[PDB]
Each structure stands twice: as C-alpha cells, then as structure tokens.
Ligand binder design. Sequence first.
Ligand SMILES: Nc1ncnc2c1ncn2[C@@H]1O[C@H](COP(=O)(O)OP(=O)(O)O)[C@@H](O)[C@H]1O
Ligand SMILES: [Sr+2]
Ligand SMILES: [Sr+2]
Lengths: 20, 337
Amino acid sequence: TTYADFIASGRTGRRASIHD
Amino acid sequence: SVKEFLAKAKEDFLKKWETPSQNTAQLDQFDRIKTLGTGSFGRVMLVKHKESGNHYAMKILDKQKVVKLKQIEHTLNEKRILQAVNFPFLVKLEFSFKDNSNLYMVMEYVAGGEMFSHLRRIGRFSEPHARFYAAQIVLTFEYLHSLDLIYRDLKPENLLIDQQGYIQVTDFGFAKRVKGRTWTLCGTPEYLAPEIILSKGYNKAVDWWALGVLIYEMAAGYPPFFADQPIQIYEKIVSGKVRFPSHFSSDLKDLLRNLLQVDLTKRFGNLKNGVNDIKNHKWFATTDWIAIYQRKVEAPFIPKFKGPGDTSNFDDYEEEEIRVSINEKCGKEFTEF
Ligand SMILES: Nc1ncnc2c1ncn2[C@@H]1O[C@H](COP(=O)(O)OP(=O)(O)O)[C@@H](O)[C@H]1O
Ligand SMILES: [Sr+2]
Ligand SMILES: [Sr+2]
C-alpha cells in the first residue's frame, strides 16, 4: 500500500528545510 | 468587510515594518527549562520569564553560524516580519534581543505541540478536521499576501496547536516582503512548488501550492510526493502526477487538482478571483469563514494540557548549554536586529 511504502521510507520524521 | 479590515491591517503592519521593535528584554530574565526543538541555527527552548512567571518559547540563533551559512537576510526578514504582523493564527513575538553570540526571539509558548506529531500519531485527519485547519491557513495567507508577504515554508512541523485546538503558524525563516517575483531556492522538499525547483522565478502562488500539499498530507497521512532523497521528490513534483487515496471525497480531489496545478495560470489562489476561488470551493461549503477568524468554531481536537509549562506534546531533544562569548560577534551584520 502507499501508506506502507511511506512508513517504510526514510522521511517519516520531522523534515528540515533546504536553502540551497 | 474583508477590504476594510485588510487596509487597516496594512497600515498597522507598515508602521512596524518601517520602525521595528528592538531590544525589549535580556537573557537573564528567563530561566531556560527544556528544548522544544533543535534547528539549523540553534534551538527553541521552553523558558519561564522571571518577573511575570509566564512561559514562553525562546528561539536562539548563533550569529556567526548564520553569517557563515549566508542566511543573514533570511534571519533579518524573519524577525522584521514577525514583529510586525498580527493575526489570530500567527504566533506572537513577545520579546526580541541579541547578545555577544546569539539572536533571541521570545514567542508565546504554544503548548499543544506540532501538528506533525498529532498527524503521525493518529495517522491521518478526517476531512472536517483537515478542513478546520486548512481554513485557518487560507485566511492567514490571505492576510500575509495582502501585505506583500510570501511565507514559503508551510508544513505540519511549522504549525503548532494551541490550547484551544487552533493553529499557530511559526517559523518565518523564509518569509519575505516582495511585490512580485523572487528566486531563492528555499522551503522544505515535499512542499516545494514546481516553479521553485525549476528556478524560473516565482511568486506567492507557491504558498497556494504548499496548501495543496498540506491538505493532502493532513487527509492522507502521507505527502503527495515522497521518496528517500530530495531529488527523487523533486522529480515527482515536476511531473505533477498526483494519485489520491481511496477515501478522498470528490470535492477534496477537485480542490487538490486546482491547488496542485503545475500551471500558474490555472492554480487556485492565483486566478482573477484570487483567494475567493478557494473559499468558494465546494470542499469548503460548510466553512463559516468569519466564525473561523473569530475562533468561535468548535475545534475537532483539543490537546491535553497538564499545566502552563507542560511539554508532554513535544519530543525530547539533547540539551546543550547556551554559551555567550565575552567578545561581540557579527555586530554589524545584525545591527538592525
Ligand atoms: N512558539 C512556539 N511554541 C512552542 N513550540 C515552538 C514554538 N516555536 C517553535 N517551536 C518548536 O520548535 C521547533 C523549531 O522551531 P522553528 O522556528 O521551526 O526553528 P527552525 O526554523 O530552526 O526549524 C518547532 O517545530 C516547534 O516544535
Ligand atoms: Sr522549522
Ligand atoms: Sr526556519
């Protein structure tokens, strides 16, 4: 499922900003 | 009406924009209790103000590091704008000051924690629940954009929930006052509009795109474009192919198709009727816009609070002692702070 693929991914925690 | 209110809001904003508040407290008037979040240039700490006894959230930024990483303008923007705005869903800056080593922004403490935490914990929000928060963001962007401000960092980690269950937007780090187009590559990968990634030059319509991402993520439990590395996200964003969960209402998918529109002449919020195209959309038909502004709508979720200094709704972070040098650093760079 899309949910399971998201939860098994590397970006389910707090996400930092980018500026470059 | 709308117009009236917004014109008097601009007059108060411009007054503080042109003569900002400076130096309204000092560090030893706060007892630092615990870190509420760490960030690129420092951290945000729960503090208690000794003379009033009130709790606040103190954002601490290392001056030398901000200069080293070339974020001076963005930092001065952040403070100059936050001290000048006033709106029910914007966090309030109560004090600001600087010392030899750091910049400090002392805000109201929003004790309900990040929307992020609640969203991951419960999985996803119902459409009425997501709509309740989305309406506050629509009204807040209407306000900010009328001031020629772009926000540029909408995400659940920058949205806090207050004791009444309403949203408080925080982190004005990429907020900028600009009438037309700007070019900085900034924001948070999952929330970036395609025109940012494509280095085309862009305008406040990027905030309406980001709303589309936020509404999706709130209602689905995951973002519309996700992968393990930013560049893989960027690729999906620019394709703009979006797939919706089974349970999304027809109205919700139609709104999102209009917000997550790769094409600027087509994106809602950026057309001739401006925000009204969003307010009048069928997904918001049950929404009482004035009641929301006035905070008279019952929130769908109320954070459990155990006393004014309770941090149960925040994660734990590693503490670090705040150092202050006996030599002034970067005085001239931050003169106006
Ligand atoms: N006024 C506030 N009240 C309570 N917590 C806050 C407040 N401001 C910030 N925080 C917490 O600190 C975290 C980081 O603050 P933020 O302004 O986003 O710093 P940064 O831009 O370096 O990430 C927020 O995500 C939230 O968890
Ligand atoms: Sr942030
Ligand atoms: Sr920031």
